[model samples]
Target: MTEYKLVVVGAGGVGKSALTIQLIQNHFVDEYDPTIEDSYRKQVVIDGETCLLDILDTAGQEEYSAMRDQYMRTGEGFLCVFAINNTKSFEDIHQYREQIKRVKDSDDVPMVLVGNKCDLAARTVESRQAQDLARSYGIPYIETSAKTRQGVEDAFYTLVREIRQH
Candidate 1:
C-alpha cells in the first residue's frame, strides 16, 4: 500500500477535523457538537493509494499555535480551510495561508480552497467572494458541509489531482 502524507491546519472550529473525518471515514461531526480536544488522526485509501491521513486538529488558540509550523513543513499538501458562516473565518484562513507560505518558504505546495459548511449556505456570509479569492490565488475552491457531507471529494480529489500531476 502506498501512503501519502497530508497535513491540515486552520483556525479552531473551522471544521478541520470534520473535513478530515469526512475524508477518512465518511463521517462528519456537526459544528455545534464541540471543539476537538486538540487534534485527530485517521487513515484512508484513495483507489490503490493508502494514506495514513493525520489531522493535526490544532486549536488556533494562542497557546497551541506553533505546532502548525512543524505540521506545515513535513506535509506534502495543505488544506487551508474556512467556514462560510462567518467573514472573519475566511479572512483568517487567507492570513494563515500566507503565514504558512512565508514560514515554509514554499508557496508551490499544493493547496486547495475549502469553503466548508455549505449545508449552512442559508447562513452564508460571503459566497461570491470565495471564487474570486481562489482565482486570485490560482487555487481550486470547493464548498463542503461537515454537517450534510456536501462536496466531500472536491477538497481531497482536487488536491489529489493537482498533486499527482506534479
Candidate 2:
C-alpha cells in the first residue's frame, strides 16, 4: 500500500495550516500556532478512488530551507502557497519553488501554485500576476480561501490527481 505524500509549503502567515486543516478535517480553526512541521494522514476519496493521503505542513521561514530539502526529496507533490494580501509572501514562493527544483533535480515534478486569502477583498498580488508566475513554472495556479473553504478541496484534489498522473 503506497501512500501519497504531499507537502504544503509557503511563507509565514500565509494560511498554510488553515488550508491544510480545513482540507484534511473539514473544519476551520480561527486560531492556532504556526506549523513547525507536522504530518496529517487520512483515508480520502479522490475522483472516486480511495487512498491514503499524507499531508505535511511545513514551517514558513527561510531558516527551514535546509530541512525542507529532505521534505522535497520525499514528497510526491507540492502545494506552494502565497497570500494575496502580503507582497513578501507572494515573492517568497520564488525561493521555495527554486529550492524544490534544486532538491528534486527535475522540472517535471508535480506542483501547484496557490494564492491563499482569496476571500480578502484587498489583494496586493493580483490573480494575473500569480498566474503568470505559475505559467513560468508550468504548473497550475489556484486561488483558495481557508476560512470560507473555497477552492481548498480543489487544491488538494488537483494536487493528488497530479501526483498520481505523474
Candidate 3:
C-alpha cells in the first residue's frame, strides 16, 4: 500500500478536529461543550489512494510540544489550521512555522496552511497575511467552514495533489 501520513495540527481551538470530521464524514458534532483530548495514531486513508493518514486532531490538552514533535516526525504531510475570523490565529504563524521546521529536516513533506471557520467572515481576519505566510513557507493556503459544509474537501485533496506532483 502507498501510505501517506497526513496530520492536522495548529494551536488550540483552531478547529483541527472539526476539519478532520468534516473531511471524513461531512458533518460536525454540536456538543462541543468540552473539546476532547489530543490524539495520535498510525494512519487513515482518503480518496481511495491507499495512503495512510496519521491524523493528529489535538482538540484538548495542556501542551502538545512533545506529541507534536513526534507526530510531525513520522508524518508525510501536515495541515496547519487557523481561524479565518481570528487574526490572532493568523498572527500565530511565527510559532507555527517554527514547529514545522523542527518537525522535519527535509522539504519533501508537504505542508498546507488552512484558514478555517469561513462561515463567520464578518469578523474577518487579515487572511492575506495568512496567505503570505503560507507562500513564504511554500505551502498552499485554503479556507473552510465545516458548519456549512464548505471547502473542507478542497483543502485536503489540493495538498495531496501537490504532494503527488512533488
The candidate that achieves the highest TM-score relative to the unseen native structure? 2
Clash tally, candidates in order: 0, 0, 2
TM-score comparison, 1 vs 2, better candidate: 2
RMSD of each: 2.8, 1.6, 3.1
- The CA root-mean-square deviation of candidate 1, after full C-alpha superposition on the true structure, stands at 2.8
C-alpha lDDT values of all predictions: 0.70, 0.88, 0.70
Better of 2 and 3 by lDDT: 2
Clashes of 1: 0
Tens digit per residue, CA lDDT, model 1, 1-166: 4445556666767787787777767877655443333444566566667655554454455565655576666666677788887677887877877876876698777778888877774555576688888888788888888778788767876776666765
Clashes of 2: 0
Query: Which window of 10 residues has the lowest lDDT sum in candidate 2?
Result: 61-70
TM-score of each: 0.81, 0.93, 0.80
Model 3 weakest 10-residue run by lDDT: 33-42
Across 1-166, the per-residue lDDT of candidate 2 in tens digits comes to: 4578999998888999999999988888788576668889988778777789899898886665457677768888999999999999988898888878887898788999999999998899999999999999888999999999999999988898888778
Highest lDDT against the true fold, candidate? 2
lDDT of 3 by residue, 1-166 (tens): 6655567767677787787777676678554533443444434465666665445565323453445566567666778788877677777756765766676876556878888888884656676777788888878889888787688878877767766766
Error of 1 at 70 (Å): 1.3
